[PDB]
Amino acid sequence: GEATLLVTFGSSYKAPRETYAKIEKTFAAAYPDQRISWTYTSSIIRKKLAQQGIYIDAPDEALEKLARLGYKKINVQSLHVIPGREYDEMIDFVNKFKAAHSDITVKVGRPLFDTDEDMREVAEILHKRFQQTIEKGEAIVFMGHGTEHAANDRYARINKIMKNYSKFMIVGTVESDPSINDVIAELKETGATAVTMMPLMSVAGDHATNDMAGDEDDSWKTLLTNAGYTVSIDKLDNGNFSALGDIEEIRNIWLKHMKAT
Ligand SMILES: [Mg+2]
Ligand SMILES: [Mg+2]
Ligand SMILES: [Mg+2]
Ligand SMILES: [Mg+2]
Ligand SMILES: [Mg+2]
């Protein structure tokens, strides 16, 4: 008997939690006999959800509960985009758990942008999603968070990989490099005058939605409109802002990572 624990930072908001449900459904369909469990690593988000009647286990709680149920084989899957700080803290609570349980074998699955192969697959999926927009000469801008962690290199790396698919697919980050000014300089080279944006994030969290599309003077929508672009935000059919985890083929990459060799 195998069990799977899905690891994310977490969110208290309805739209990200619908994306989480899609990820659970993808894993449950692939492994219909397995228990699938969740942990949200943000302590404060867990606390706010508890105030709402929604009870999410802390990581140590989540794994101990699996141990107390008899499981000797546990999969712990990162739902992160890059192998950065949160991925490292995953490994840490996984090892704190392995130490207390020498008989339990724990398999760890990597985040989305782990390898060049992963980033090509993501680029192809996003190209497919936006091909009709790209065909009209409109650019697609992907907004990642950005970090000082060395894994920040994935954003510049997937930006270059995306050039094999279209010059109109452009990646930047809010807090690091490539920056919004790099995005604007790249846009200028394409000849586009219209932009569709999407977060290069697993879910469209509340803070990210403001960074991307808010009326704040430094939101990406404002800064691109100041530059003269006509800006649209990508949405799901249900009207929510889209994110990577909403795309079934993206969810399959986390799925494959859980068993990769
Ligand atoms: Mg990440
Ligand atoms: Mg799609
Ligand atoms: Mg990101
Ligand atoms: Mg969404
Ligand atoms: Mg969807």
Side-chain angles (χ1 to χ4, degrees), residues 1-109 111-261:
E2 297 193 29
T4 289
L5 175 71
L6 300 177
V7 182
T8 184
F9 188 78
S11 168
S12 52
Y13 289 82
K14 170 183 163 113
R17 271 177 56 71
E18 294 180 347
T19 305
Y20 292 146
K22 300 171 195 179
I23 297 170
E24 180 171 338
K25 182 171 200 77
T26 288
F27 275 74
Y31 296 95
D33 52 330
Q34 287 201 19
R35 186 185 281 290
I36 298 148
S37 286
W38 281 91
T39 187
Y40 299 1
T41 65
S42 162
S43 163
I44 183 68
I45 285 166
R46 287 194 313 269
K47 287 182 197 312
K48 302 182 46 83
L49 285 171
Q51 294 177 171
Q52 279 158 36
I54 292 159
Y55 305 110
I56 307 287
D57 299 314
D60 296 338
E61 205 169 13
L63 283 163
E64 264 312 299
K65 187 176 288 186
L66 289 180
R68 276 185 316 220
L69 283 160
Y71 292 100
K72 302 294 146 183
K73 170 48 155 323
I74 304 179
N75 310 296
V76 186
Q77 176 59 46
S78 165
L79 297 182
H80 312 110
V81 174
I82 62 165
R85 180 193 47 72
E86 286 175 32
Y87 185 60
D88 291 343
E89 267 138 46
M90 192 167 64
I91 300 291
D92 289 351
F93 67 75
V94 162
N95 288 340
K96 183 175 199 153
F97 174 80
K98 294 180 174 201
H101 305 272
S102 57
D103 49 337
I104 306 185
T105 67
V106 184
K107 166 76 165 70
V108 170
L112 201 62
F113 296 175
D114 201 31
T115 68
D116 277 358
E117 195 197 3
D118 290 329
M119 284 192 272
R120 285 196 274 273
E121 196 173 350
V122 170
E124 158 194 37
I125 289 159
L126 293 174
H127 179 267
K128 184 190 317 263
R129 175 165 184 90
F130 293 104
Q131 54 189 312
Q132 279 174 348
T133 297
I134 292 168
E135 190 173 347
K136 314 292 177 293
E138 307 201 343
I140 320 301
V141 163
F142 298 99
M143 188 200 77
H145 187 58
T147 174
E148 301 290 288
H149 195 286
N152 194 70
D153 71 333
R154 299 309 198 279
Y155 297 107
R157 286 167 64 186
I158 197 169
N159 194 46
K160 281 78 218 162
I161 284 166
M162 293 186 167
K163 302 294 124 43
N164 297 337
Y165 302 83
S166 176
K167 74 193 178 161
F168 289 102
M169 308 171 52
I170 298 167
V171 173
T173 73
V174 177
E175 295 299 338
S176 193
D177 307 299
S179 67
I180 181 59
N181 303 295
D182 293 315
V183 167
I184 283 157
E186 202 175 338
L187 279 171
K188 161 108 200 72
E189 280 310 292
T190 67
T193 51
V195 173
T196 293
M197 298 196 276
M198 151 171 210
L200 204 66
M201 323 193 150
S202 324
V203 300
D206 181 67
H207 186 239
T209 308
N210 302 315
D211 282 346
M212 174 174 60
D215 40 299
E216 286 205 52
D217 296 322
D218 63 358
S219 78
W220 279 30
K221 189 167 145 143
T222 302
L223 294 179
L224 290 174
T225 302
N226 288 351
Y229 293 96
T230 65
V231 176
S232 287
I233 306 306
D234 192 52
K235 297 166 179 331
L236 305 182
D237 283 358
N238 68 17
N240 296 348
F241 290 169
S242 67
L244 293 179
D246 294 318
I247 302 169
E248 176 171 319
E249 289 195 320
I250 298 291
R251 298 196 293 273
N252 287 340
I253 297 175
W254 285 310
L255 183 59
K256 295 191 285 203
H257 286 187
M258 197 181 60
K259 293 300 186 179
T261 296

